[PDB]
């Protein structure tokens, strides 16, 4: 198989510091924009969506350097690289006790008349603040130790510098 | 007069040319096929009869020379001493008249021996039959007897598979079931074993340059840059196009020559074949205006197949088929025979068009084009000459095309049923007629042809493409697209939510009420809307 | 007796490049149209987890004692060879089938097309431009994922060597229990959370791992591989008439790959089972009663090809003398079929010759076209992963496809034995036909996903009894005929075939002279095949296809139906024991004129 | 040009090789048996050192054989319980006792090559991971980049009375390193 000097299982609790929205395909009769649910209908963070948030932040950290990012997150193009060394699982979101998915209303306000623009009325389901989900990372090290960029990533998560899901500029994530 | 008619014909062409996926072998294999009944025929004739057919071929690089009475005399009448006349020569077939049986026999020996040596694995044979000219119509009888007996004598003959027999200890060809015999090189320069069959194909890929570059100086000028160029490209398209009705004409041609005389049958029969060949070549030279990034694997007779740049193949084939119709209207030697056969002075062809991403296997993509051509060729039953009996297809030219977007599966039956979601409904109108509605107006099946007219698709694509912003947003086209996979009641429900918000949608309606994307057809519900969304980016033209 | 049970703990995706509707990628689905894990995925995933275990025990040495054990259990990977290897590649000890949903759940789905779709859902995916933070053009996909909580089970077979010491058996169980427990993910997008699983063997637990932990330092090299050589006795009776014919019914329980040829990267499949595939089962079941290897050498045994069952009987390869109307006729249309051995071509309408498929029975006053059977087939696409990049690459081929006969097809072969060999058996076992029921694996890739078939024996059928017509002799090739020229190579011709029958039957034959009626309708055939015992391909066999026909006017003498019967049993030409050479004389489907006829959850 | 061929019937393989031995000197042989396919080499007298026990049929024995050298090839195939047909094919007209002589004309003979399995691993050894080793009878040692080709001649002649040419036989010659 792929040689692995050490497998690191890196795990903890992630908490929503503001309401989340990871979108599904969209629309659900209750809202225009609808949360992603797993096959059991439970709300979850897809590991694709979380993995991309982490890979995204590292790319901003490493000044958009490709060369190092591909050595953690893997590649398809380079004949030497292929599959990802960081593995990110799906994580189910546990909403607080008695709490439930909230619907946020939205409107677009016509800049000339100062009133709601025609058609620009929408609503979004959001996971309430304080919901929890498991951090589900595995890392297959072929070198010794742990990459410092992967340590910076975990420091950034503990600092709460990473945002996940939609509407990141408008309150969420 | 008495003599013999020689028929020499090449079998198994589709297996020989199209099996191996390697572009150099498909080009190389198609070249060995063309040369066998031209270059090698004329060399064979010259070695037997002491004629100079090869010199005129190689100087002219065209078959038209054998039409000329000084260059290809009559065997009949004493006015000329000639003991050979070529009645016809073409890709895959040749026919000749010879006044002595031994030279008839020796000609077939000569041509086939050279094929065994210079073109191993090419299957070629011939037949000669007694031709009697004291029957006013014996030459037409000789042709039909020769074609009939050739099949029977093919069976009682040693096959092309009876050589290169495997011993247990001999390695394999990499590209064939045959035992390896030679070495060659991969595109990355790694050595590979090949058979003598594949070796000679790959060697011969260069020899095709000289022929095609006479068709146009742009074609196949550097084969390795074509392979490099195709990989850089976004889509390819295997185009296959085939002529309609010539086979029924030529099996019955005694009816259409006019004067029931051997000399007229020869003269008419020869000229028709050469005329078709020029019509195909001329129409191809017109069609390439839409684009160099085009490889003719086959071009001749009524038959074309090429690997085009994709997203230029609907227009190339449309332009080819329209140009081919226009050529056959204007060419005198077809006009009267077509006029007598089908009541209109033109012929027609249909095309199957795979459209494929460039790495996808050619041998699979060509097998689609063979199935798409069969669907396009269904017009040969739905549009027919009124009160003909037995019912003859009316000359109509049609396309069927795919656009794969897949990595493996490629079963035309799975492909088309997976977008036939409900028993009343099919989401494709895809055998599209390219013939102008004017020409068809006097056939049976006219209204069917108008529902299937390519201009309906090409118009709808323009509306999708029309605009500072989209007339119909993609955002909304994909809402409709999703609903089309539901029951028609739900599909019409979604359209009725939209149909007044986007005034362009009146043009996409098909009900005559501006309330459904579906029209009834043969009891089914069918739509063009999904063909227009698929083909939207495969209607580009340099014009 | 072993199973693997897989519990899927997150939504899972497998198997197909194709995509159907508004989804871009669709999951692999079995013959019930329900999602499942292909046995080649399961083997490849389980091997990979066992490879990690062995790579750890070797202290990271990529070759070593423990990688020897993996190659012992899972077979060698030729095409990873880096230098001269002199031993032939070992096959695997472990066969792992495909994992299917619970059979009682699968029954509930039957016919409920809307429910079969609901087992999965669309998962969206988007790729985002790193500087702008917005979705990239083109980078949108919607993907089918199957709902988590699916519990699937696979059959497993460990056909261990007949001599492995109990210490070594515990090592094998230790590794497999270890590799199963290390296996955590399978299918597509594993690295992004799809396809998390629990994989468990029946009867392997932490006790199997714990034994290995306690003992791995003691472990030796694996035993050497040895072929199961044949063994003859030479003791068979002489062959004596009659010939008993025992029908064997084959039913496919999983897809079967029967290699016709490879074109590009796709292996094409036959639509019948050649008799050579059944000799291994004949060896298994009857080699205890008589010397099966001597019987083959003497020709006292024939196992025919298995062809699709029609009318309760083996379907017969469509005769090339049948021609269909090119516009809208032929056996696929069920009308407009002409027997060109007896009927002229009609005026005007051109015909296409028949080229394949099988016809059911026909009788000399059928009033109908013979029942025509079709064989369903499916294309399965696979990949090969290069282990360091963990993705397929050109250096390991990486993509290939098998055509296969799908499950549920039924085929009929016939074992023929002379009376003297049935006496040999029946003196030893009165119920011997009961021992012919078996489940066996045939084909390419037989050890995993492909090739599982039921065999059932019928009751002894009657010997064929052709009509001894002295006017014309007509020969239908029910199977491929291999003849040797007088130089003992296969370049024989139809004139060699005339002499063969002429000499065999003691009659002189001449081609019928009627100008409208075709006398001969053959096609050439070439078979390329391996031989597993040799470890080298067979010599190439050349001949004529099944369905080929010819008819001769008898010049002198008289044809004897007794000898026609005997040739219809034993066949003609080379390798008749594999069912080559099987032939049909004066069958009325060649004699008749056909142009007028028409076809007949809980 | 004549390709000569000599036929004898109801002959055992041990007896066929013995009858032709004067012409099969140093002949390479290829023996087909139900368990294995064997290369062999006859010595310069034309004999196989263990011929009877190698060439017997009776117990999973050889059922088909080919023997070839520069001048001729012997073919044998079993037809009843170890009695077979011998056919020896030669460019030269040669006296053979008991064999029935015949010949056929051919137009031309073209040489052919068949690549043997594998790279180099008296007798030499080729090897390929697809098949393992193949020991081949070849006197010169092989360098690490060599290949061995079996070599042959294909004989072309008219088959049809319409003059269609075909290859009427292929004769094997020798192993050659390339
Ligand atoms: Mg909505
Ligand atoms: Mg795009
Ligand atoms: Mg998509």
TrEMBL record, chain A:
Residues 14-173 form the CRISPR type III-associated protein domain. This is CRISPR type III-associated protein domain-containing protein. It comes from Synechocystis sp. (strain ATCC 27184 / PCC 6803 / Kazusa). The chain holds residues 2 to 174 of 522 of the full protein.
TrEMBL record, chain B:
Residues 236-382 form the Cas10/Cmr2 second palm domain. It comes from the Bacteria. One of its GO terms (biological process) is defense response to virus. Keywords: Antiviral defense, Nucleotide-binding, Plasmid. GO terms for molecular function: nucleotide binding. Pfam families: Cas10-Cmr2_palm2. This is Cas10/Cmr2 second palm domain-containing protein. It comes from Synechocystis sp. (strain ATCC 27184 / PCC 6803 / Kazusa).
From TrEMBL, chain C:
Coiled coil: none annotated. Mg(2+) 2 binds at residue 138. It comes from the Bacteria. Residues 5-198 form the CRISPR type III-associated protein domain. One of its GO terms (biological process) is defense response to virus. Keywords: Antiviral defense, Metal-binding, Plasmid. Mg(2+) 1 binds at residue 24. The keyword Acyltransferase does not apply. This is CRISPR type III-associated protein domain-containing protein. The lineage of its organism: Bacteria, Bacillati, Cyanobacteriota, Cyanophyceae, Synechococcales. The chain holds residues 3 to 616 of 791 of the full protein.
UniProtKB/TrEMBL annotation, chain D:
This is TIGR03984 family CRISPR-associated protein. Keywords: Plasmid. InterPro entries: CRISPR-assoc_Csx19.
């Amino acid at each position: 198989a792929r040689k692995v000097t050490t497998r690191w299982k890196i795990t903890g609790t992630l908490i929503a510091e503001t309401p989340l929205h990871i979108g599904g395909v969209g629309g659900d009769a209750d809202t225009d924009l609808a949360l992603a649910v797993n096959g059991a209908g439970e709300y979850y963070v897809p590991g694709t969506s979380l993995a991309g948030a982490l890979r995204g932040w590292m790319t901003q950290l490493l000044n958009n350097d490709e060369s190092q990012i591909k050595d953690l997150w893997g590649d398809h193009l380079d004949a030497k690289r292929g599959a990802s060394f960081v593995i990110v699982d799906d994580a189910v979101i546990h909403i607080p006790n008695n709490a439930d998915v909230e619907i946020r209303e939205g409107v677009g306000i016509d800049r000339h008349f100062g009133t709601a623009a025609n058609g620009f009325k929408y609503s979004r389901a959001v996971i309430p603040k304080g919901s929890k989900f498991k951090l589900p990372l595995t890392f297959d090290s072929q070198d010794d130790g742990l990459p410092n960029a992967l340590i910076q990533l975990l420091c950034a998560l503990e600092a709460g510098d990473i945002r996940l899901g939609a509407a990141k500029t408008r309150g969420l994530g | 007069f008495q003599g013999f008619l020689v028929l020499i014909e090449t079998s198994g062409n589709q297996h020989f040319i199209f099996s191996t996926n390697k572009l150099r072998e498909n080009i190389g294999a198609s070249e060995l096929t063309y040369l066998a009944t031209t270059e090698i025929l004329f060399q064979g004739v010259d070695r037997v009869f002491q004629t100079n057919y090869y010199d005129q071929w190689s100087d002219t690089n065209s078959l038209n020379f054998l039409a000329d009475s000084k260059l290809n005399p009559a065997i009949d009448d004493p006015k000329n001493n000639a003991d050979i006349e070529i009645l016809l020569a073409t890709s895959g077939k040749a026919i000749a008249l010879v006044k002595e049986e031994g030279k008839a026999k020796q000609l077939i020996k000569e041509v086939t021996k050279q094929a065994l040596i210079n073109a191993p694995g090419l299957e070629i044979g011939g037949i000669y039959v007694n031709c009697n000219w004291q029957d006013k119509l014996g030459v037409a009888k000789a042709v039909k007897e020769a074609h009939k007996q050739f099949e029977v004598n093919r069976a009682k003959r040693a096959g092309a598979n009876g050589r290169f027999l495997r011993l247990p200890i001999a390695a394999g060809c990499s590209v064939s079931e045959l035992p390896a015999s030679d070495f060659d090189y991969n595109a990355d320069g790694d050595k590979i074993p090949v058979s003598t069959v594949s070796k000679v194909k790959r060697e011969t890929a260069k020899s095709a340059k000289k022929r095609l570059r006479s068709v146009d100086g742009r074609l196949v000028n550097d084969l390795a840059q074509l392979e490099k160029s195709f990989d850089e490209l976004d889509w390819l398209a295997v185009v296959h196009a085939d002529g309609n009705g010539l086979g029924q004409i030529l099996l019955s041609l005694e009816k259409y020559i006019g004067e029931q005389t051997n000399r007229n049958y020869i003269d008419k029969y020869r000229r028709l074949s050469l005329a078709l060949d020029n019509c195909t070549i001329n129409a191809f030279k017109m069609a390439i205006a839409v684009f160099l990034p085009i490889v003719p694997l086959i071009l001749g007779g009524d038959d074309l197949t090429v690997i085009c740049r994709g997203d230029y193949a609907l227009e190339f084939t449309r332009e080819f088929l329209e140009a081919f119709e226009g050529q056959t209207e204007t060419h005198d030697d077809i006009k009267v025979i077509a006029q007598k056969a089908f009541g209109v002075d033109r012929l027609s062809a249909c095309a199957g068009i795979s459209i494929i991403k460039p790495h996808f296997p050619f041998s699979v993509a060509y097998t689609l084009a063979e199935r798409l051509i069969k669907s396009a060729k269904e017009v040969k039953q739905k549009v027919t000459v009124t009160n003909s009996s037995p019912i003859t297809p009316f000359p109509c030219s049609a396309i069927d095309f795919h656009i794969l977007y897949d990595s493996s599966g490629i079963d035309f039956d799975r492909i088309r049923e997976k977008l036939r979601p409900e028993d009343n409904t099919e989401l494709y109108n895809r055998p599209y007629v390219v013939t102008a509605a004017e020409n068809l107006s006097q056939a049976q099946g006219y209204e069917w042809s108008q529902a299937h007219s390519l201009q309906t698709l090409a118009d709808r694509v323009s509306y999708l493409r029309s605009e500072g912003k989209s007339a119909l947003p993609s955002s909304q086209s994909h809402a409709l697209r999703t609903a089309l996979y539901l029951e028609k009641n739900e599909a019409d429900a979604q359209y009725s939510l939209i149909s007044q918000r986007y005034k362009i949608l009146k043009n996409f309606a098909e009900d005559g009420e501006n309330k459904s994307l579906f029209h009834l057809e043969n009891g089914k519900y069918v739509t063009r809307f999904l063909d227009a969304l698929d083909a939207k980016d495969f209607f580009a033209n340099a014009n | 007796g072993i199973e693997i049970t897989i519990t899927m703990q997150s939504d899972w995706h497998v198997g197909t490049g194709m995509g159907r509707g508004e989804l871009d990628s669709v999951v692999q689905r079995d013959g019930d149209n329900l999602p499942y894990i292909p046995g080649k995925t399961l083997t490849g995933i389980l091997r990979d987890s066992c490879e990690q275990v062995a790579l750890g025990l070797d202290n990271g040495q990529t070759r070593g004692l423990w990688h020897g054990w993996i190659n012992f259990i899972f077979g060698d990977q030729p095409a990873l060879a880096q230098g001269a290897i002199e031993p032939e590649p070992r096959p695997a000890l472990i066969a792992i089938g495909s994992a299917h949903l619970d059979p009682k759940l699968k029954a509930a789905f039957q016919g409920k097309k809307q429910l079969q779709e609901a087992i999965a859902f669309m998962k969206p995916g988007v790729a985002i431009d790193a500087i702008t933070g917005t979705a990239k053009k083109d980078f949108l996909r919607f993907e089918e994922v199957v709902r988590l909580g699916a519990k699937l089970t696979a059959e497993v077979e460990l056909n261990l060597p007949d001599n492995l010491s109990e210490t070594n058996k515990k090592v094998i169980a230790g590794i497999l229990a270890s590799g199963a427990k290390l296996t955590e993910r399978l299918g597509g997008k594993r690295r992004r959370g799809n396809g998390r699983c629990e994989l468990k063997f029946s009867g392997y637990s932490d006790q199997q791992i714990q034994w290995l932990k306690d003992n791995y330092q003691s472990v030796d090299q694996p035993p050497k591989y040895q072929q199961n050589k044949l063994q003859s006795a030479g003791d068979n009776p002489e062959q004596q008439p009659p010939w008993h014919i025992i029908p064997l019914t084959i039913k496919t329980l999983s897809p079967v790959v029967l290699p016709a040829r490879t074109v590009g990267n796709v292996v094409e499949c036959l639509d019948y089972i050649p008799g050579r595939y059944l000799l291994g089962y004949i060896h298994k079941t009857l080699g205890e009663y008589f010397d099966v290897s001597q019987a083959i050498a003497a020709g006292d045994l024939i196992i025919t090809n298995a062809t699709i069952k029609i009318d309760g009987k083996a379907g017969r390869a469509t005769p090339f003398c049948l021609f269909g109307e090119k516009l809208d006729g032929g056996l696929g249309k069920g009308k407009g079929v002409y027997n060109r051995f007896q009927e002229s071509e009609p005026d005007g309408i051109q015909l296409k010759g028949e080229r394949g498929g099988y016809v059911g029975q026909f009788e000399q006053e059928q009033r109908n076209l013979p029942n025509t059977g079709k064989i369903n087939s499916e294309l399965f696409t696979h990949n090969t992963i290069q282990d360091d990049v963990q993705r397929p690459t050109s250096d390991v081929g990486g993509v290939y496809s098998y055509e296969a006969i799908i499950a549920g097809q039924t085929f009929v072969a016939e074992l023929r034995l002379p009376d003297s060999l049935v006496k040999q058996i029946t003196s030893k076992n009165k119920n011997w036909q009961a021992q012919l029921k078996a489940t066996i694996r045939i084909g390419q890739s037989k050890k995993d996903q492909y090739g599982k078939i039921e065999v059932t024996s019928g009751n002894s059928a009657d010997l064929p009894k052709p009509t001894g017509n002295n006017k014309t002799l007509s020969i239908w090739f029910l199977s491929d005929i291999l003849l040797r020229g007088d130089r003992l190579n296969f370049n024989a011709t139809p004139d060699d075939l005339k002499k063969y029958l002429e000499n065999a039957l003691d009659i002189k034959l001449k081609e019928r002279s009627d100008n409208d009626l075709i006398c001969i309708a053959l096609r050439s055939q070439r078979t390329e095949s391996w031989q597993v015992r040799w470890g080298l391909p067979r010599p190439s066999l050349v001949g004529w296809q099944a369905g080929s026909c010819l008819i001769y006017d008898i010049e002198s003498g008289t044809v004897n139906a007794e000898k026609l019967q005997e040739l219809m049993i034993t066949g003609i030409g080379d390798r008749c024991t594999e069912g080559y050479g099987q032939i049909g004389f004066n069958d009325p489907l060649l004699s008749a004129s056909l142009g007028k006829l028409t076809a007949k959850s809980n | 040009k004549n390709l000569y061929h000599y036929h004898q019937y109801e002959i055992t393989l041990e007896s066929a090789v013995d009858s032709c031995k004067n012409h099969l000197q140093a002949a390479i042989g290829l023996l087909y048996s139900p368990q294995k396919c064997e290369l062999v080499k006859l010595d310069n007298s034309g004999k196989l050192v263990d011929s009877y026990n190698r060439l017997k049929f009776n117990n999973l024995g050889v059922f088909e054989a080919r023997f070839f050298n520069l001048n001729c090839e012997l073919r044998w195939v079993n037809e009843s319980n170890g009695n077979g047909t011998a056919v020896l094919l030669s460019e030269s007209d040669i006296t053979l006792t008991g064999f029935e002589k015949g010949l056929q004309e051919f137009i031309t003979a073209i040489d052919q090559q068949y690549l043997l399995w594998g790279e180099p691993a008296g007798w030499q050894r080729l090897a390929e991971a697809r098949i393992g080793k193949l020991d081949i009878p070849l006197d010169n040692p092989l360098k690490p980049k060599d290949r061995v080709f079996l070599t042959s001649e294909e004989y072309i002649a008219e088959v049809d009375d319409f003059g269609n040419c075909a290859v009427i036989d292929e004769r094997l010659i020798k192993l050659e390193v390339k």
